[PDB]
Structure 1
Amino acid sequence: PQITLWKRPLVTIKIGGQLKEALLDTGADNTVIEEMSLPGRWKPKMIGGIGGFIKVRQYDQIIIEIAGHKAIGTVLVGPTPVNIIGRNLLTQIGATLNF
């Protein structure tokens, strides 16, 4: 796909068996999803942005299907106002910014 940026670049993802909407976010180092359960071990992290920091759970080796493309990597879970797909998984689906 080629996604213009007139609107928020939202896509459908599948994570933990669940279908969700998420923002493709080149400004995010890592993927951050709204509170949900995921399997396996986790450890706490703080992530910061405009407005300050939030505490998240870091889960490693999580598979997400993004717009029909499979990716694996770290997923942070916590009180983000929006589900964000960050660069750690955008790279795996071969996403680029072109102009």
Structure 2
Amino acid sequence: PQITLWKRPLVTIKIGGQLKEALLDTGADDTIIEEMSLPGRWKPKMVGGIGGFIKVRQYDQIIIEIAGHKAIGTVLVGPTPINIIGRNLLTQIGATLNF
């Protein structure tokens, strides 16, 4: 699909067996999801942007489905104000910004 930018580019994702809405964010290096359980090992990470940093749990090799496109990658979990799909998974679904 072609997603204009008149409104926030929010899509449905499926992660960890759950459906969530998330923002496709070309300004995010990483994908950050609000608190939820994920399987496997995790390590702590600090990520920052406007307003400073939050601490998250980094889970690697997590499968996600973004707007019906499957991918795998690292997912950070923590107190993000909105779920964000960042470039580490946007690449995997073949997302480009075009103008």
TM-score tier after normalising by the smaller chain length:
over 0.9
Q: Which runs of 4+ in 1 moved over 4 A?
A: none
User: Structure 2: any 5+ residue segments left out of the alignment?
Assistant: none
- Residue aligned with 1:88, SS: helix
Q: Percent identity?
A: 96
Give the whole-Å Cα distance in 1 for the aligned partners of 2:37 and 2:3. 30
CA RMSD of aligned residues (A): 0.2
Per-residue deviation, residues 27-63 of structure 1 (Å, max 9, x unmatched): 0000000000000000000000100000000000000
- Residue aligned with 1:93, SS: coil
Give the whole-Å Cα distance in 2 for the aligned partners of 1:43 and 1:14. 22
- Residue aligned with 2:7, SS: coil
* TM-score between both structures, scaled by the size of structure 2: 1.00
- Residue aligned with 2:92, SS: helix
- Residue aligned with 1:5, SS: coil
* TM-score between both structures, scaled by the size of structure 1: 1.00
